[PDB]
Amino acid sequence: LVRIEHTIFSLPFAYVGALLSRYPFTLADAILMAAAVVGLRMAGMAYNNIADLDIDRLNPRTAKRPLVVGAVSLREAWALVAAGSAIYFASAALLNTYALLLSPLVLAIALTYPHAKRLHPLPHLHLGIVLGSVVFGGAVAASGDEASSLGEVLRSVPWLYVAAVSLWVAGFDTIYSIMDIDFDRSHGLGSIPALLGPKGALAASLAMHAAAVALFIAGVEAYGLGAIATVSTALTALVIILVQAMAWLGRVKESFNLNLAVPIIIGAGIIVDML
């Protein structure tokens, strides 16, 4: 099962990469961006529920997840995988030739992630590069109309925010993986808290989130930015500190739940900047 509404919280990071790429784009292009995200998230969320099924049945927390219960088939699931992948490839095609060209690599990143925990620890990075690929996509989505070569469109990407956003989610996924230290151990699943314990995860979490705020800041001087953007940059940097704060005070659910401010702050920041 997949809930489409959630994708709202992923859109801002795409438009960020489209703006911080000084190239222009149309309302049409902007809709295709959203579509591509919706597809990508659809496919990801779908395939996630599949690849983790065998172990989602064993874990107590995920015993309530769909298709563990049997609320949906693998068919219905694989249908959304195909569907999402398509409405991504579709939107990627109506955009640019580079967007389309890079589609499979971006989709690959999204679909390989659920296996990261089976190969190595720090799947949290893998998870974050997925959100990095969104802003990356947002960039290429703009630097194909209009653009010339691959060098340019790669030069078009604001890699600070790519890495910043990646380290941000890698950080709270690390905090989120504390509750599964026990289950991920024994069952041979890779986690950084399963490798270092809670105190040690919090640490690596803090290191990530530190470097995140560093980049969010460095992006101001670098990519110029302005008042509203700098205000937003500060607010997101502010939130990232509470999720750390609340997490070091145990109290991790509200810490995790807090991260929804960052999309909203960014999204609102863009909307106000346009006006």
UniProtKB/TrEMBL annotation:
<dbReference type="GO" id="GO:0016765">
    <property type="term" value="F:transferase activity, transferring alkyl or aryl (other than methyl) groups"/>
</dbReference>
<keyword id="KW-0479">Metal-binding</keyword>
<feature type="transmembrane region" description="Helical">
    <location>
        <begin position="159"/>
        <end position="179"/>
    </location>
</feature>
<feature type="binding site">
    <location>
        <position position="56"/>
    </location>
    <ligand>
        <name>Mg(2+)</name>
    </ligand>
</feature>
<protein>
    <submittedName>
        <fullName>4-hydroxybenzoate octaprenyltransferase</fullName>
        <ecNumber>2.5.1.-</ecNumber>
    </submittedName>
</protein>
<keyword id="KW-1133">Transmembrane helix</keyword>
<keyword id="KW-0812">Transmembrane</keyword>
<feature type="transmembrane region" description="Helical">
    <location>
        <begin position="125"/>
        <end position="144"/>
    </location>
</feature>
<keyword id="KW-0808">Transferase</keyword>
<feature type="transmembrane region" description="Helical">
    <location>
        <begin position="25"/>
        <end position="47"/>
    </location>
</feature>
<dbReference type="GO" id="GO:0005886">
    <property type="term" value="C:plasma membrane"/>
</dbReference>
<feature type="transmembrane region" description="Helical">
    <location>
        <begin position="200"/>
        <end position="220"/>
    </location>
</feature>
<dbReference type="InterPro" id="IPR039653">
    <property type="entry name" value="Prenyltransferase"/>
</dbReference>
<dbReference type="InterPro" id="IPR000537">
    <property type="entry name" value="UbiA_prenyltransferase"/>
</dbReference>
<feature type="transmembrane region" description="Helical">
    <location>
        <begin position="226"/>
        <end position="249"/>
    </location>
</feature>
<keyword id="KW-0472">Membrane</keyword>
<dbReference type="Pfam" id="PF01040">
    <property type="entry name" value="UbiA"/>
</dbReference>
<comment type="similarity">
    <text>Belongs to the UbiA prenyltransferase family.</text>
</comment>
<dbReference type="GO" id="GO:0046872">
    <property type="term" value="F:metal ion binding"/>
</dbReference>
<feature type="transmembrane region" description="Helical">
    <location>
        <begin position="256"/>
        <end position="275"/>
    </location>
</feature>
<dbReference type="InterPro" id="IPR006371">
    <property type="entry name" value="Polyprenyltransferase_UbiA-li"/>
</dbReference>
<dbReference type="InterPro" id="IPR044878">
    <property type="entry name" value="UbiA_sf"/>
</dbReference>
